[PDB]
Ligand SMILES: Cc1cc2nc3c(=O)[nH]c(=O)nc-3n(C[C@H](O)[C@H](O)[C@H](O)COP(=O)(O)OP(=O)(O)OC[C@H]3O[C@@H](n4cnc5c(N)ncnc54)[C@H](O)[C@@H]3O)c2cc1C
């Protein structure tokens with residue numbers, strides 16, 4: 239009786255899809271070529287947010303539903319330690335994780351945030367140090383800073399590991415360490431996956447959650463979602479003897495606590511100087527510059543060094559927006575590939591579980607289906 | 618107003634400086650490297666009163682340290698440095714004897730078995746436990762001592778005017794048998810009414826040739842830190858093969874007393890250090906879901922003394938206005954030592970809980 243579902247990829251998205259499918263009664267096989275949470279989800283600022291999406295109201299609403307889903311799922315776990323919400327401070331001219339530099343006036347931006355219901359407040363530049371006194375007074379500038387007091391970041395690898403553990407223990411999910419090389423397709427319907435050893439894993443549904451590898455996973459077996467990948471480098475300090483509670487997104491650097499005093503540092507500007515295949519050396523020129531910018535922002539960081547550097551590729555559909563759903567003329571197959579995948583992961587899990595188990599697409603995804611990239615009329 | 622110099626900005630010095638500044642002293646905190654950058658940065662940091670049980674007096678001191686770490690949280694906004702998901706502990710002296718002693722003294726501990734662990738942490742390999750009894754400390758956890766030290770130092774500066782000096786103390790300034798300040802390695806002098814040496818394993822090196830020394834028996838410790846791991850583990854584990862616990866965003870901290878015996882004092886903390894690689898293997902044997910997770914960091918530190926009974930926390934007899942703090946369970950005791958030594962310096966009231974740690978006991 240039970241529907242057999244294969245989820246390819248165990249990142250923040252695939253772990254969510256697999257967990258909700260298994261909870262929904264499906265017999266789930268999660269196929270992961272590397273390790274649970276070891277892909278781009280391991281190299282992310284991971285701000286769970288809708289406030290970076292003020293141009294598309296429907297994309298804002300999708301990201302807001304993702305944010306709400308991350309709060310709701312915590313109730314299903316014991317002592318979940320993966321969603322830290324101490325607040326986020328965002329400057330005018332800050333770079334966005336979703337892309338670009340935001341030069342809009344903070345008061346105009348705040349009016350829109352209020353109208354769209356996002357929890358936020360403004361802080362005068364001269365009052366920022368009341369919240370975080372170790373910020374350099376010379377680094378703050380003169381414009382108001384947006385404070386998202388209930389916002390924070392995910393630990394996507396810990397999240398993915400916890401959901402996979404629960405899916406296995408509570409709902410009989412199986413984890414397969416293997417690399418999908420293509421799909422098995424019979425009469426226009428996908429009937430399973432083929433691994434790179436030629437072995438076949440049969441299923442009633444296949445959900446491709448392989449991130450920036452989305453098209454390489456299916457090869458010639460499925461239509462491709464056009465992608466526009468970019469590289470990201472993140473530097474992680476040794477544990478730092480500073481008091482910083484909140485995430486900081488200044489015109490110079492994006493930085494935040496990442497556990498036990500460690501700091502995560504990144505910059506869109508510096509990403510442009512990183513090659514796709516650069517070695518993540520601890521003395522990488524952009525990692526060293528990230529540390530310099532962090533110390534200029536918080537001078538109390540003196541003598542704290544870089545302990546880790548990670549590099550990954552962003553899954554980004556060609557038009558910037560999520561692609562979650564079926565593709566033309568291939569039954570029993572779904573794909574999920576998107577930027578802001580941390581924000582959206584939990585919601586994508588419940589949305590695709592509803593589609594696979596009950597044939598019920600969520601209305602929030604209406605503007606974000608893969609079909610928009612293909613022919614709209616019969617050829 | 619009393620002028621106090623605290624040397625060393627680890628978990629102990631930051632606590633002493635914080636409570637002294639809170640108490641009205643003008644505090645100068647002198648740190649040669651960085652706040653929280655010493656042994657406090659390389660610690661399992663279990664806040665506990667159950668390791669290496671000896672006397673009820675030693676338990677009461679460690680328990681007061683544990684309670685002080687909970688109480689201090691109320692003085693800070695959203696403190697993120699004390700994680701209490703529970704601790705699980707099993708061996709291959711006797712664990713029942715230890716469990717019974719802890720229950721009799723009132724410590725929150727429970728005796729469970731491998732089937733109970735399967736419910737709490739299902740990704741632990743049952744083979745790693747066997748039929749051994751398991752002690753669960755359900756309200757216990759660990760500190761982030763570097764984040765703690767940085768937060769207390771920030772608060773002391775903002776709220777109470779503490780000054781932080783990046784400098785290396787080379788000796789004490791003494792006038793007619795009384796300490797009147799410190800001398801830095803550039804020859805400059807910082808004067809004060811009281812000096813509290815909280816330089817950890819560097820305690821004797823800090824004061825140099827013209828000041829008293831306390832006994833030390835140093836040993837080396839290595840800790841390996843994994844990249845973020847896709848496992849669900851909530852609790853800290855203390856097992857026969859490895860002590861391992863979450864350390865942030867999925868990272869795991871790994872260490873072992875047995876493997877520490879094979880580490881040299883000046884070993885480079887290489888990511889492929891032979892004992893770091895063996896720690897990773899033992900961690901995967903304990904939690905097989907750790908497959909393909911690698912080592913991301915390795916840190917090495919020196920412990921000044923191997924057991925709590927070697928500790929020297931209090932005034933030093935042959936020199937006035939001078940205190941020292943050398944501990945074994947420095948994370949557990951840090952907050953309490955802060956309030957205890959602040960009380961001595963400000964009010965001349967030595968806490969009786971520190972009586973067994975008096976440095977004067979080493980001088981006849
Ligand atoms: C620097 C940076 C900062 C970011 N900041 C944010 C932020 O603040 N907020 C936000 O919401 N998003 C942010 N993101 C985006 C977010 O991190 C990603 O969108 C998200 O992690 C993608 O998740 P995923 O599960 O789709 O991909 P992944 O985590 O990469 O998971 C895909 C998995 O598929 C596996 N796989 C691949 N090919 C195969 C195969 N053939 N067979 C089997 N398994 C396979 C891989 O091993 C991998 O584990 C950021 C991204 C970057 C790079």
Ligand SMILES: Cc1cc2nc3c(=O)[nH]c(=O)nc-3n(C[C@H](O)[C@H](O)[C@H](O)COP(=O)(O)OP(=O)(O)OC[C@H]3O[C@@H](n4cnc5c(N)ncnc54)[C@H](O)[C@@H]3O)c2cc1C
Nearest residue numbers: 625627628629649655656657660661662663786817947949
């Ligand atoms: C592997 C390991 C595991 C541990 N696990 C636990 C545990 O589970 N529970 C527990 O309670 N404890 C534990 N401990 C013990 C605990 O970590 C230490 O006792 C504690 O961190 C010591 O703090 P401290 O402030 O005294 O020393 P430190 O943190 O070393 O601080 C001393 C400071 O003095 C500075 N300094 C040195 N010389 C000078 C100078 N001349 N001038 C100025 N500054 C100077 C140094 O730079 C340093 O920052 C563990 C220790 C180790 C090594």
